């Protein structure tokens, strides 16, 4: 409820915009996607969903768009309008303060642009507002990004596991200043392992080819994203302990001229999204040739995020791990 | 509304652990309670905001007959588990709820609490601690008994320049084609509004500190809604005053012994560090000059304070006026 207030306050700070804008892979790929697909913009009507500082709307204008509606719900809207004026684009970019679910637009649009992707793609639940915005999209219209692929792969990383395990085991102490805390170990492990780990890693820690789950933004309905079910079956390529699942995502800007990809894969140049790892509370032993199967379930919550459920098992042994994660509250290990 | 987020934060075992592991903090509380055993032996105790229960366990180690441990977060349930597993059900009673809303079955001899935040007053929990005196027997004691806030002018060219280094990101005429320069002034203002949390060498301090004292035995809840701290500094060192540094001490004034808990820069580091409020316009002062003004802390709806600092060099008449948001500190400690 009031969780939404804090969400939009976060985006009101220029300090946050600076960090975002300094992701050169993010900013550069968006610009390339838009400019190299200029025919998708030339003399067209554009909607920018959550424009922030206005940067994507400026790209749209660079690509020759006739009119851009730049919708922003935080007080960043005021700073956007300052930039539109100072950059002499008042005749083309129209900042509209407010939520995209609530504002009126005078016109339907040829193309929607946005950066709705959060950590693990889904965090922030902005994909829903992005899909909601399709009420303004003409029949023959496009969305940038067009689709999104989430990848997941099993990883081995004892150092990470043991760091999180060691923190939780503070609550295994039997005489902390003479007090037995040990009755709370189970609660601590639950809590610490509930946090997804945001950082990057060497790809050599991945034990199988990634499973991918695609969302088509042209086709999906807002309601589809309330419950996201991702089944998986990994064919294990290396033997060892599986400490959890690594997550990343790519998005594609499928234009009339080119498809441009923005990847957050660990094989690609680093972005501010990094990668996301969900640890198992207890690792699963797998041998090469084994199959690790189960289900990643994402359930939309009232905190602009998802409750994550990961159930995984080594088919050959019946060894099973069940995990609950709180995507809203990641551990930023970088 | 932001009270809900406040209590959610303390519902995490990791946040409780953060404070428990502050050795200076937790060890000093234990030593103040145990070394003043006669203030506790066979006595009735109220622990305001018991969290994990750790201070209530210390009161039990010191021989208290009965300890009412009040906790408003869901941490109350975990504290209860610890009381059971430590076989202290007969002596420690966990009462879930806000100290302003629950009922106690009897009046107490002594109130213990750790309600300090940054610059002493952040989080406004001292209002709850003072509110709790409605449960205190006449001539009952409080641990801590008094609190001192210290302020002193500092010089720190590196810290000051940093603000411009960061804000100057906006001072560029073609960021991917966009003139960002019109936002530089707003970016500067933003950074100066955040109090800086980290530690420093005492050599940066330009004058003897002044102190503002709260006597918890005497103070009323309402006294903390507006805190006016006048200051006159007779300058020890010539230089540019880049702002005011803040720290605090509390004293536990027991029957046997007074024990001090200090967060001073001359003392070992605690989880509170120290806090510096910068001046966007610095003040030049020579040794022997007097730097006078007022630091006014005005309580706000976000469990924090709006900080207004006005300072002048009496000899030159040159002044600096500053507004900071204590709810949004910059954590600089690296
Ligand atoms: N993480 C990227 C960020 C900026 C991207 C931008 N393109 C930048 O680079 O500046 C998303 C933006 O979307 C806004 N936002 C989120 N939801 C909504 C909404 N429902 N209605 C309007 N704005 C929203 C939110 O306040 C934020 O400023
Ligand atoms: N300062 C940190 C901590 C000390 C923990 C422990 N004592 C430690 O020293 O380790 C304060 C505790 O007070 C609770 N709290 C804050 N306000 C209230 C209130 N009005 N009513 C009940 N609980 C409150 C709050 O949820 C938190 O658990």
| Run of H or E residues at A214 | strand A211-216
Strands (E) located in A219-318: 227-235, 240-254, 259-263, 275-286, 291-300, 306-314
Instruction: Establish if A87 touches chain B: CB-CB under 8 angstroms.
Output: yes
Which of B72, B80, B100 for mutating ligand 2's site (highest number of atoms within 8 Å of CB)?
B72
User: Which ligand lies nearest the alpha carbon of B178?
Assistant: 1
Approach to solving: X-ray
Domains, chain B, with CATH or none: 1-144 (3.40.50.150), 146-334 (2.70.160.11)
Transcribe B185-227 into DSSP letters. Answer: HHHHHHHHTSPEEE---GGGB-S--EEEEEETTT--GGGGSEE
Is residue A268 part of the annotated active site? The answer reads: no
The tokens for A327 are 């995507």
Contact in structure between B136 and B111 (CB atoms under 8 Å): yes
CA pair distance A90, A105, nearest whole angstrom: 17
User: Which ligand lies nearest the alpha carbon of B118?
Assistant: 2
Mutate to test the interface with B, among A4, A6, A14 (most CBs of B within 10 A): A14
Check A15 against B176: CB less than 8 A apart: no
CA pair distance A56, A116, nearest whole angstrom: 12
CA pair distance A15, A17, nearest whole angstrom: 6
CA pair distance A47, A42, nearest whole angstrom: 14
* Among A21, A50, A43, A49, residue whose Cα is nearest residue A92: A43
Report which protein residue has its CA nearest ligand 1's atom 11: A50
Q: Which residues of B touch A21 (CB under 8 A)?
A: 169, 175
Instruction: Establish if A177 touches chain B: CB-CB under 8 angstroms.
Output: yes
* Among B125, B192, B120, residue whose Cα is nearest residue B151: B120
Which of A126, A130, A262, A264 for mutating ligand 1's site (highest number of atoms within 8 Å of CB)?
A126
Rounded distance from Cα B36 to ligand 2 centre (Å)? 23
Which residue carries 């959890």 as its tokens? Answer: A244
| Run of H or E residues at A130 | helix A126-132
Q: Which residues of A touch B20 (CB under 8 A)?
A: 170, 176
- For helices A55-62 and A24-35, the axis angle rounded to 10 degrees is 30
Phi, psi at B32, each rounded to 5°: -70, -40
Contact in structure between A82 and B182 (CB atoms under 8 Å): yes
Measured between CB atoms, which of B26, B27, B182 is closest to A86?
B182
Contacts of B139 (CB under 8 A, 6+ apart): none
Contacts of A79 (CB under 8 A, 6+ apart): A14, A17, A53, B183, B186
Mutate to test the interface with A, among B26, B183, B189 (most CBs of A within 10 A): B183
């Amino acid at each position: 409820e009031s969780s939404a207030v804090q969400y939009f306050q976060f985006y009101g700070y220029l300090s946050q915009q600076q960090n975002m804008m300094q992701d050169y892979v993010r900013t550069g790929t968006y610009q390339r996607a838009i400019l190299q697909n200029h025919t998708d913009f030339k003399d067209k009507i554009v909607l920018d969903v959550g424009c922030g500082s206005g940067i994507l709307s400026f790209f749209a204008a660079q690509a020759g768009a006739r009119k851009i509606y730049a919708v922003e719900a935080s007080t960043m809207a005021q700073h956007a309008e300052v930039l539109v004026k100072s950059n002499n684009l008042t005749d083309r970019i129209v900042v509209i303060p407010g939520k995209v679910e609530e504002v009126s637009l005078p016109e339907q649009v040829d193309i929607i642009i946005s950066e709705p992707m959060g950590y693990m793609l889904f965090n922030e639940r902005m994909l829903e507002s992005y899909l909601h915005a399709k009420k303004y999209l003409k029949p023959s219209g496009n969305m940038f990004p067009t689709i999104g692929d989430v990848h997941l792969a099993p990883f081995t990383d004892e150092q990470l596991y043991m760091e999180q395990f060691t923190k939780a085991n503070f609550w295994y102490q039997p005489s902390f200043h003479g007090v037995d805390l040990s009755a709370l170990r189970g609660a601590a492990v639950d809590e610490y392992f509930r946090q997804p780990v945001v950082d990057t890693f060497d790809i050599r820690i991945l034990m199988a080819k990634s499973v991918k789950y695609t969302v088509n933004f042209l086709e999906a309905k807002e309601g589809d994203l309330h419950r996201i079910e991702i089944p998986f079956k990994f064919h294990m390529l290396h033997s060892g302990l599986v400490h959890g699942l690594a997550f990343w995502f790519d998005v594609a800007f499928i234009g009339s001229i080119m498809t441009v990809w923005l990847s957050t894969a660990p094989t690609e140049p680093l972005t501010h999204w990094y990668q996301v790892r969900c640890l198992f509370q207890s690792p699963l032993f797998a041998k090469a040739g084994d199959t690790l199967s189960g289900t990643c379930l994402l359930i939309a919550n009232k905190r602009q995020s998802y409750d994550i459920s990961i159930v995984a098992q080594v088919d050959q042994t019946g060894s099973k791990s069940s995990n609950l994660l709180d995507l809203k509250n990641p551990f930023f290990r970088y």
